[PDB]
Amino acid sequence: VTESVLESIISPVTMSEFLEEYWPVKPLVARGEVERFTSIPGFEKVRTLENVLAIYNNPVMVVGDAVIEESEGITDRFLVSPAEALEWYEKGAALEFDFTDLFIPQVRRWIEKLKAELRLPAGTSSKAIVYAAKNGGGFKAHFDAYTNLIFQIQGEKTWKLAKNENVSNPMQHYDLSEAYYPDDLQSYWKGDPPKEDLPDAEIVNLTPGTMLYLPRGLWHSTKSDQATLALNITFGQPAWLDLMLAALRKKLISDNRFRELAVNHQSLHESSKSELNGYLESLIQTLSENAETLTPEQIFQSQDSDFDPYQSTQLVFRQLLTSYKF
Amino acid sequence: ESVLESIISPVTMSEFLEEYWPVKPLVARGEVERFTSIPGFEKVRTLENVLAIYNNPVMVVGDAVIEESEGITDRFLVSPAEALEWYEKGAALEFDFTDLFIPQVRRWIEKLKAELRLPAGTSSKAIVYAAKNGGGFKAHFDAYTNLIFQIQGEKTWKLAKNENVSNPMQHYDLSEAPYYPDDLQSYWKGDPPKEDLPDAEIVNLTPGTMLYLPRGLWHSTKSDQATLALNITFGQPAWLDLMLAALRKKLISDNRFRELAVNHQSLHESSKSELNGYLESLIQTLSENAETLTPEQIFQSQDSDFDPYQSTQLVFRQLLTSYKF
Ligand SMILES: O=C(O)CNC(=O)C(=O)O
Numbered sequence: 132v133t134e135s136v137l138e139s140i141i142s143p144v145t146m147s148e149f150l151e152e153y154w155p156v157k158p159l160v161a162r163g164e165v166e167r168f169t170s171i172p173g174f175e176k177v178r179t180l181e182n183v184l185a186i187y188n189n190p191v192m193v194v195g196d197a198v199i200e201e202s203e204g205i206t207d208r209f210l211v212s213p214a215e216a217l218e219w220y221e222k223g224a225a226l227e228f229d230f231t232d233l234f235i236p237q238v239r240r241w242i243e244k245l246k247a248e249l250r251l252p253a254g255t256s257s258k259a260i261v262y263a264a265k266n267g268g269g270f271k272a273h274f275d276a277y278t279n280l281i282f283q284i285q286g287e288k289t290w291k292l293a294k295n296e297n298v299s300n301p302m303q304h305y306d307l308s309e310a311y312y313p314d315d316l317q318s319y320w321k322g323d324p325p326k327e328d329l330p331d332a333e334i335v336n337l338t339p340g341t342m343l344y345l346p347r348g349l350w351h352s353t354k355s356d357q358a359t360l361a362l363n364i365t366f367g368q369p370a371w372l373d374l375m376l377a378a379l380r381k382k383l384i385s386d387n388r389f390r391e392l393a394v395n396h397q398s399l400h401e402s403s404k405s406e407l408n409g410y411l412e413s414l415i416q417t418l419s420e421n422a423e424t425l426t427p428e429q430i431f432q433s434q435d436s437d438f439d440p441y442q443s444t445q446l447v448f449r450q451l452l453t454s455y456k457f
Numbered sequence: 458e459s460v461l462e463s464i465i466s467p468v469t470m471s472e473f474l475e476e477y478w479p480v481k482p483l484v485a486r487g488e489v490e491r492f493t494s495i496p497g498f499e500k501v502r503t504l505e506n507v508l509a510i511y512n513n514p515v516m517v518v519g520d521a522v523i524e525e526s527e528g529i530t531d532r533f534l535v536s537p538a539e540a541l542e543w544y545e546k547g548a549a550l551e552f553d554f555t556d557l558f559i560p561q562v563r564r565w566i567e568k569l570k571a572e573l574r575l576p577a578g579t580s581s582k583a584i585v586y587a588a589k590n591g592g593g594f595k596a597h598f599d600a601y602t603n604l605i606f607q608i609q610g611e612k613t614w615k616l617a618k619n620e621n622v623s624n625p626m627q628h629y630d631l632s633e634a635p636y637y638p639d640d641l642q643s644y645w646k647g648d649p650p651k652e653d654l655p656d657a658e659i660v661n662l663t664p665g666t667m668l669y670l671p672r673g674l675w676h677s678t679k680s681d682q683a684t685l686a687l688n689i690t691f692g693q694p695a696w697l698d699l700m701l702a703a704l705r706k707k708l709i710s711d712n713r714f715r716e717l718a719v720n721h722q723s724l725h726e727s728s729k730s731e732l733n734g735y736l737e738s739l740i741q742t743l744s745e746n747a748e749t750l751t752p753e754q755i756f757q758s759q760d761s762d763f764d765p766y767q768s769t770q771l772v773f774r775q776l777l778t779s780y781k782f
């Protein structure tokens with residue numbers, strides 16, 4: 132059958148069904164034999180923890196209660212060498228091998244293809260990540276501003292999934308162990324947080340060969356009683372706001388008045404403060420008039436902008452680090 | 458209004474702010490003991506000391522890297538323990554965010570930021586540069602500004618007034634002169650400078666010389682023999698940065714603006730028409746909120762992140778400060 136890699140994996144669900152009833156809002160669980168994952172380019176290289184370790188020349192994130200206890204409560208995660216990560220792994224810390232696509236770079240082709248098949252803006256952030264855990268490790272209840280296609284490779288992993296009644300379309304991460312909401316999030320958080328154990332969540336056991344589509348914003352937590360290994364393909368979720376502000380900035384960056392250095396008005400004398408306010412009024416009027424002339428075509432024309440400079444910077448930095456042998 | 462005074466004397470801080478900052482370079486010569494006023498200066502006064510304290514990836518830059526990478530790149534990050542090998546091959550070493558290891562200097566940098574009237578959120582750091590054997594950086598301009606303190610050796614700087622772009626918002630290497638980033642293209646005027654910046658000012662920076670290097674000024678560097686310098690590097694956030702931050706904060710509360718965007722030419726004709734009306738409506742709302750913008754709201758955003766490239770690198774490096782390289 133002339134099928135896409137994604138189609139091959141979610142069969143007998145069609146890609147149209149996926150796009151109409153699941154993406155980008157509802158989770159999908161697709162079960163089957165792990166061998167159908169072998170059409171993912173580079174899968175054989177990340178099929179076992181020993182294989183991932185043989186190729187992954189980068190720092191590894193470790194997360195969990197052992198980190199909280201060692202750090203005397205300062206943090207729940209460290210970035211460490213692959214070797215040290217194995218020491219933490221034995222203490223039940225979850226290991227995250229981020230930007231695994233640097234080390235199976237053939238998957239990058241596929242990811243870009245999948246990004247187009249999902250009709251994501253070209254500029255959307257995308258990567259592969261490997262997650263490994265044992266001894267009850269994993270992640271406590273949280274949500275992400277990203278969506279994931281999750282391919283369970285080894286072991287049985289317990290996911291909790293709950294609808295998020297507090298925020299629609301979150302644009303930042305949040306750990307439920309913060310109960311305090313960060314600034315932007317505070318502006319659109321509604322209602323009471325869920326309990327730490329997500330008591331109303333759906334529990335899903337992921338086994339080898341299970342693919343889980345995980346939409347952005349769902350509350351989730353993970354636990355690996357025994358050793359597990361999974362490969363995630365992780366996508367940004369650029370908002371209309373992202374594209375609109377990129378388009379507006381493209382219209383304004385040409386104007387030297389907008390490129391001039393900004394000034395902290397705090398130290399200024401009152402007359403200078405007022406003059407700055409009049410200068411800024413001029414800018415405000417011009418910004419508003421450029422916003423008023425914004426068109427759909429211009430918004431679409433900025434779909435190839437960098438909407439996640441945090442992810443892009445982390446990719447560049449990790450690429451530069453490959454010159455050290457971790 | 459005091460921190461720089463003893464270093465740029467006889468230039469006064471008022472003269473510096475009115476006549477030089479943020480557009481024209483200044484060269485202040487004097488005794489290097491001046492620099493003892495900077496917290497932690499003793500700890501970066503030789504390359505040995507820097508290497509003793511700097512527990513982070515070190516950037517190495519130059520011909521030796523071009524060779525090792527078979528032409529792919531001129532830079533990469535290595536361990537402090539491997540950096541000296543590259544230095545001996547004439548690669549320039551960049552110890553980025555050196556202020557992570559001399560925390561003392563943060564207070565100083567913050568005072569300077571306040572003195573210069575920079576937005577509170579402006580990026581700011583210390584960087585040490587070391588090179589020998591003709592190593593350094595080829596002709597380019599930065600979107601950052603730098604206060605440069607020459608500690609050791611005689612370093613050849615070329616400096617050239619930028620006649621092409623005012624207040625650039627990104628980095629540019631003169632060597633890429635066929636190609637121009639889209640944004641830069643939209644405000645570049647005229648022809649790029651000539652190869653090797655023939656009309657440049659040549660300035661030999663000797664120990665105790667401080668160079669103020671404004672954003673956008675063309676420069677390049679060469680260390681014939683060993684050199685060591687400390688930079689204090691500041692972002693240059695534009696009014697556009699604060700204003701778009703303020704506008705985003707007004708809109709991020711509205712779920713319509715947080716909804717997932719789509720690839721235009723992936724969807725059907727019916728869908729392509731159905732998106733136009735929704736986007737026209739959103740554009741109306743964006744415009745209405747832009748018309749509500751006040752100077753107060755712009756200033757209330759001065760503590761935002763205007764430089765995710767720098768902030769991201771800082772967080773990453775902070776997670777590596779006790780890494781066993
Ligand atoms: O895989 C895990 O243990 C945790 N993964 C996530 O939270 C995620 O993919 O967003």
Ligand SMILES: O=C(O)CNC(=O)C(=O)O
Nearest residue numbers: 586593594599603678688
């Ligand atoms: O110090 C050097 O050799 C090069 N430095 C710069 O380009 C800079 O400070 O912007």
Ligand SMILES: [Mn+2]
Nearest residue numbers: 273274275351
């Ligand atoms: Mn998650």
Ligand SMILES: [Mn+2]
Nearest residue numbers: 597598599676
């Ligand atoms: Mn420079």
